[PDB]
Design a protein around this nucleic acid. Structure first.
Length: 282
DNA sequence: CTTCAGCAGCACGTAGGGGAGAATTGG
RNA sequence: CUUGCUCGGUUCGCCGAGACUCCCCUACGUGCUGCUGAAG
DNA sequence: CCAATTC
C-alpha cells in the first residue's frame, strides 16, 4: 500500500481548529498519563461513546461520529500500551539473558548469580514516565472521503473542477539552440510554471517570479473537496495523478472517478500543508 | 591547562512504540 | 507522465539527470555550545 | 441518503 502526497490548495480555516483535531488532542491529553488501574475503568457504539465522553472529562466540541471517534480511541490506547510494550519486551529480553546465563550456571554447578532489576513505565506517583506526545494527524474516514469538485454543490470559490468522467488532459518555447538533444525517452513533462525551473541557484538569472508559477499551477488544478462538518479541504489531485502515472497503473486513461478509485481514508498533517493518500491492495 | 564527569541539545545516524478500511443497513 | 522534492546546463525562453514507505512520539548519542570537580 | 453497524 504505497503512499502519495497532495498539496492542500484551499481551506476555510486552519486544520488545527477543526473539531476532529481538537477532540483528538483532548482525548490524547486526557488518556496520556493515567495510573494502570485508572485506564482499566476508563478503557463501537453511539451509546458507548456517549457515556465514555461523560465518565471521562473529555469534552466533545460538536463531534459525535462513530467512524470519527473510535479511531482516536483505538490509536490512543494502543500507543499507551505500546509504551508499556517497549518496557515489557526489554524486560522479556532481560529474562532471556537471565535464562542464558542460568543455562551455563547449571553446567558449572554453581548457585545462580544475582540478576539485575527490571523497569516499568510508571513512576512512584502513579502517572506514566514516558508520556507520549500528541499526534496531530487529522485522520479521515469513510463517510467523509475525497470527493471531486462540483461547483453546484460545494461552496463558491475560485477554482475549476472537471467532470467526474472524462479522460484528464495530457511559454515553453524550447528555443532552437535547445533542440539537439531533447529527451527522446519517456520521462516527466514539467511546465513553464514548474518551480524546479525557477529555483535560485548561481547559474540561473531569471529566478522565481513570486506569484506567476503559483497562479499557473492553480489555473490547471484538479480539485477534490473533503468536507468534514462545516469545514472543507480543497486538494490538488495532480500529485495523485503523477503517482498513478509513473507507477505503471494507468496510461492517459482515467477520470475523477477512477483516479480516486485507486483509499478514501487520507491522513492530513496540518503543519506541512499536506495530505497523504493510500492505494488499493496492489 | 589539562585530563575526565553528567545533563542539555541548533546537528546526525539508530532504535522501537504507534498509524496508514470498506461492507451492509435503517429510518 | 500537469502539482510538489534533489542535482546539474543556459543565449534566462526551459532543458537535462534522478528520489519517491511515509507521518508522529519517547529516549539516547557523536562532533560543537553550555555548567563543574581533579593535576603542575 | 447517510450516519450508524460488523470484522
Amino acid at each position: 500500500c504505497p503512499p502519495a502526497k497532495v498539496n492542500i490548495l484551499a481551506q476555510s480555516r486552519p486544520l488545527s481548529e477543526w473539531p476532529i483535531n481538537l477532540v483528538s488532542k483532548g482525548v490524547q491529553e486526557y488518556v496520556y498519563g493515567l495510573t494502570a488501574a485508572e485506564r482499566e475503568a476508563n478503557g463501537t457504539s453511539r451509546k458507548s461513546l456517549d457515556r465514555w465522553f461523560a465518565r471521562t472529562g473529555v469534552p466533545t466540541h460538536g463531534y459525535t461520529t462513530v467512524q470519527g471517534l473510535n479511531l482516536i480511541l483505538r490509536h490512543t490506547f494502543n500507543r499507551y500500551d505500546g509504551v508499556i510494550k517497549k518496557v515489557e519486551t526489554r524486560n522479556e529480553k532481560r529474562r532471556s539473558k537471565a535464562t542464558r546465563i542460568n543455562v551455563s550456571r547449571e553446567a558449572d554447578g554453581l548457585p545462580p548469580i544475582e540478576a539485575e532489576p527490571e523497569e516499568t513505565a510508571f513512576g512512584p506517583d502513579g502517572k506514566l514516565k514516558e508520556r507520549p506526545g500528541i499526534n496531530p494527524s487529522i485522520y479521515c474516514y469513510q463517510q467523509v472521503s475525497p470527493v471531486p469538485y462540483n461547483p453546484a454543490k460545494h461552496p463558491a470559490l475560485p477554482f475549476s473542477g472537471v467532470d467526474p468522467g472524462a479522460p484528464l488532459p495530457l511559454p515553453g518555447y524550447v528555443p532552437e539552440w535547445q533542440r539537439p538533444h531533447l529527451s527522446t525517452k519517456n520521462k516527466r513533462i514539467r511546465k513553464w510554471y514548474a518551480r524546479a525551473n525557477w529555483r535560485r541557484k548561481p547559474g540561473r538569472k531569471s529566478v522565481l517570479d513570486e506569484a506567476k508559477l503559483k497562479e499557473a499551477a492553480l489555473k490547471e488544478a484538479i480539485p477534490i473537496i473533503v468536507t468534514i462538518g462545516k469545514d472543507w479541504i480543497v486538494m490538488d489531485a495532480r500529485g495523485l495523478l503523477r503517482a498513478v502515472y509513473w507507477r505503471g497503473i494507468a496510461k492517459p486513461g482515467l477520470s475523477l472517478k477512477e483516479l480516486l478509485g485507486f483509499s478514501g481514508d487520507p491522513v492530513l498533517d496540518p503543519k506541512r500543508g499536506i495530505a497523504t493518500f493510500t492505494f488499493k491492495l496492489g
